[PDB]
A paper describes a structure:
While this crucial step in protein maturation is executed by two types of methionine aminopeptidases in eukaryotes (MAP1 and MAP2), additional roles in disease and translational regulation have drawn more attention to MAP2. While MAP1 and MAP2 share the common pita-bread fold, the latter is additionally characterized by the presence of several insertions and a charged N-terminal extension, which consists of segmented regions of alternating poly-acidic and poly-basic stretches. However, the major determinant for binding to the tunnel exit is the MAP2-specific insert domain of ~60 residues, which is locked in between uL23, the universal binding site for nascent chain associated factors, eL19, and [name] helices H53 and H59 (also termed ES24L). Taken together, our data show that it is the insert domain that specifically directs MAP2 to the site of action on the 80S ribosome, either the PTE or the A-site.
HsMAP2 binding to the idle ribosome is rigid in the absence of an emerging nascent chain. The catalytic core domain of MAP2 with the typical pita-bread fold is mainly involved in charged interactions with the backbone of [name] and [name], as well as with residues of uL24. In the human case, H59 undergoes a large conformational remodeling with the closing loop forming multiple interactions with the insert domain. Herein, U2708 forms the main and sole specific contact by piercing into the insert domain where it stacks in between His391 and Leu403. However, for the HsMAP2 structure, ES27L displayed higher flexibility and the interaction mode with the HsMAP2 N-terminus remains vague. In the absence of a nascent chain, as observed for our human MAP2/80S complex, MAP2 adopts a rather rigid binding mode.
Author numbering:
A (entry chain LX): 41 to 156
B (entry chain Lh): 2 to 123
C (entry chain LY): 1 to 129
D (entry chain A): 108 to 478
E (entry chain LR): 2 to 154
F (entry chain Lk): 2 to 70
Write the structure that this text describes.
Amino acid sequence: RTSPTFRRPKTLRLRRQPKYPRKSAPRRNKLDHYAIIKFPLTTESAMKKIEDNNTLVFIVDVKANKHQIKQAVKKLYDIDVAKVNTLIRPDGEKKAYVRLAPDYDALDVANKIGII
Amino acid sequence: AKIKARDLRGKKKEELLKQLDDLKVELSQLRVAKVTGGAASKLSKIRVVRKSIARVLTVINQTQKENLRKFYKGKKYKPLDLRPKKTRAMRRRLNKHEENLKTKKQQRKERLYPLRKYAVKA
Amino acid sequence: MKFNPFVTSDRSKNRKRHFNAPSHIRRKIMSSPLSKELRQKYNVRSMPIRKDDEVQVVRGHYKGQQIGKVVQVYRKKYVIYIERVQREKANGTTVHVGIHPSKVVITRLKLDKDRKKILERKAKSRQVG
Amino acid sequence: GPKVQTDPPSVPICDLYPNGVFPKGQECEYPPTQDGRTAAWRTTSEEKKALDQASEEIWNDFREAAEAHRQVRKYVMSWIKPGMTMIEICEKLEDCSRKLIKENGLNAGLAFPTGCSLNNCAAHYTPNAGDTTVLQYDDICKIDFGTHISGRIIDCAFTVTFNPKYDTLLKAVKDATNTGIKCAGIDVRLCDVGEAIQEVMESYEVEIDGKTYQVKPIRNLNGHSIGQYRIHAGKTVPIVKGGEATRMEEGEVYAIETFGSTGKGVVHDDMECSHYMKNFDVGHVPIRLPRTKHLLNVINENFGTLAFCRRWLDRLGESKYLMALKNLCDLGIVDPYPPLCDIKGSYTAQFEHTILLRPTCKEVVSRGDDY
Amino acid sequence: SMLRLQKRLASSVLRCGKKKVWLDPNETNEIANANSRQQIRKLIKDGLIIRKPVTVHSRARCRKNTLARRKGRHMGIGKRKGTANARMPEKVTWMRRMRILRRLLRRYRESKKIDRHMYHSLYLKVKGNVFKNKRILMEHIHKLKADKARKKL
Amino acid sequence: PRKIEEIKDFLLTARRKDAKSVKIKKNKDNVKFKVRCSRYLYTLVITDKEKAEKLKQSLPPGLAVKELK
RNA sequence: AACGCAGCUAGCUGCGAGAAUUAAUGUGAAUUGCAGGACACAUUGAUCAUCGACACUU
RNA sequence: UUGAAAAGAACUUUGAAGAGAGAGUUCAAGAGGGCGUUCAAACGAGAACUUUGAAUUCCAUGUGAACAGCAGUUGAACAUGGGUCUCGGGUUCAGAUCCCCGAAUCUUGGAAAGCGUCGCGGUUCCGGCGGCGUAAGGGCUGGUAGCAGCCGACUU
Ligand SMILES: [Co+2]
């Protein structure tokens, strides 16, 4: 012993091998693509954003994030997305602004959805 | 035209998934019609579609639990959910076997001196 | 007199139970007497009223011997509407007048599989006694 | 010789009548009930006749429109058959009318889109694009269409049936319409006309499927008064009792409409809107948007104050216009007229005629052998 | 009939206040229709809305008085309200004198009009308040040089 | 931005794959060539008209040429 | 304790992203302020009661 | 705490309305919804007070019961809709170092943009195209008690 102090020795630690699973089955995912997007918006300030700077306006779930929103909109409508901007409205709702890629055009896509 | 639980009980797992998918897409379309001008007929369909979705999900969730009930029928250890609930105090009391055991000393007294039936004439 | 320990004769309890009853219970309360000719045929004094039964009114302003068809059974207000019992509103429009089921007599009855079974059940009870 | 019409109508009306004088209507005396006396001086030449002469030019346009309408309805009646889609029927009728009328912008054309309504539906239904509705044997159809010459409009409608069972209902509605036309007169209270129509109509009964219904009027619907370039001039003729006591006047044009229903007798809105019109009272409202101002330009340059439908806008070549139209309706410039329907399983019938009340007599311009 | 909105948009578009906007008195109905910035831009281009000129504040009177005061017209003994030190700080007067009389002495040294040894003596006397002006100093230097020349001869 | 000083260097940079377009501006006293690359904008200033016209012809094939003037 | 859920809906009441309710069993033609929609009613069922299967945000 | 039951007062007539006079239902309304600083103009039914010219309260539209210690054609009042996404230029009825374009982390940027003025089309549509312009107190440079020249505010 070259030091005047005594320190606790190191010992073998083992991993868990449970004999039964505490929960029978994994919980179902309750935030899927359909739940992400509540509906689209048709107000007077949303109709100026489609015909000028190629964007779509949506109402989404409060607990979603920009990454989840981009995947959901892509899968449902088979479109490309560049940027998402989000704000929480004063009444407690979340509004997302999505910008389409240059190849795509908002006007035809919006007509397919039924918005315009 | 009408979704009844009895019809869907014996169908295959994949077939149920497709029906759930189609119903969800119908609901999303109806929601778009609510924000714009909507026909009285269209608005009233929302409640029918919403109940149909719940009905299919009940069948899916119910079927999967009996599959797990059979798998653990004879195993000593079961998942916590699959065990009986009752009450917390009831789960702590002794089982039927333990409650009626007796010592060797008590058994001898019962054999030697059984109770009798008698009547006193008067 | 009433001798049952677990039945109440209180005025306030009976009135509360009558005004606040589930819809299935209100069907039993709304019953009407059967006509003399029908009574002999089926040996049944009374039957619960239904949407499509012929009826005659025996009390009130509209008392008569005409026969009408029931058109709507309103259980919330304990009333029924008949074909020609009606008065005119100020505009010139016509409105139906509610009649309590106890003041009408059934002349002809709707016949369905379930109704035939209720009629049979009532007939046996009397004969046993 | 005098131009004769071809089997499929194609000659314009003006060619068939080069001189200028078009066929006349059915002329009858005014109702003799005038509080105990008759004005038989109205038939003789007087200052009334002098005033009447001053309006012969106006009457000619109405007679021309009536002739075109009669020819179009005669053509339509021949080939109508079950199994065809309603879009084809509407397109054929519109093309035939467009050819016979010889439309010249706002000089001539169709006042409103043709309306074909089935069963419970009573008015204001025309198939939009993408509609797949086929006529059935057990169906009742109402065809309403109109034409105008220089702002003089004619509105008439009839009912077409196949199955014989609806005969009694059609007869009752036709009788009520005829009685209403008979009662109409100058300086007569509208309420009396409504009472007469209701009393005549209520004395009828029908049996369809073996259940016994009573023919009763539809209280919501009513007649109207016609003006130049304005289909509704602000007067309504009721078909029921209990109403205002406005009086008719000479030189006025009226449409007498009767609707019959074997149901409750009230109508609500059930389906997608298809008819739009521009508001005559409104002035200048700031639009504040690029595309809806193109919409309003097109509207002002093709239709004016006459009604239009979405099929017409599609034919003009416009697309993606729904939001602009909705904004216009919200601002109050344009007004949407939605379809009116009765309870499911009910049946309806509609007969309408346009009459001119002249200073000297009463002329039923739309009258023809057919009805 | 009320034009509150149209007098606020115009001021923003013209980058001015609401006291410099003129609205046509006889064209009120046409102006009332405008409701957006795009329409306001159209009416300014058409003459209906104009920007009024700035009010005039001329400096001509004070420029004349300054020219008179340059020759001392309004200075006097009855027109001064502050102390002499307040009007001109005596520290500034001293500082200017030192720089003027120290720059002159240096220049003479490069041109070899004076030697370093005499230069050091004059520098300390300037610090002692002996000399007041350039003229007073140069005269002393000329007088000193003459005395040295005569002594040799 | 960056300033190129020699004509040859302008050719080498333009060949680069990142280069997206060339814009030519014709001022009264000079002609400027500007190439838009990934990170920077490079400018060549030619002061004589005759040399500039020769240079324009031999611009790298496939780079979209936009004439601002 | 909080926040959500109705065709038109603030509060009270009921419920929990299956959100004024799903399944099962009794019963047996309604609910209702207005509209729409159902429903041989047993090629199985509107509505209410009960409740033992399933589900249950922070 | 209306009435047995809304059968809750159609229609005519005065007034801008609130309010009335006739009618109508009911056994009963002697039961009627808490009931057994100056001058002009405009808009408006109406101007001492609103607008123009001359001396969640935010933002639109609509109203005038109640409130704003006088009034109100007005409102922070009442009803219905909408709005918060490392530099330089655009853009809204209401948001921008956050949206769009462009550059990044003396000269290249840079005149192509911005700002003045003068014009040409157009009228709920063109957000469209051009021409010009930006008495005494001191310095500096070139060379016997120094001079040549320009300059330069203030003070006693
Ligand atoms: Co008509």
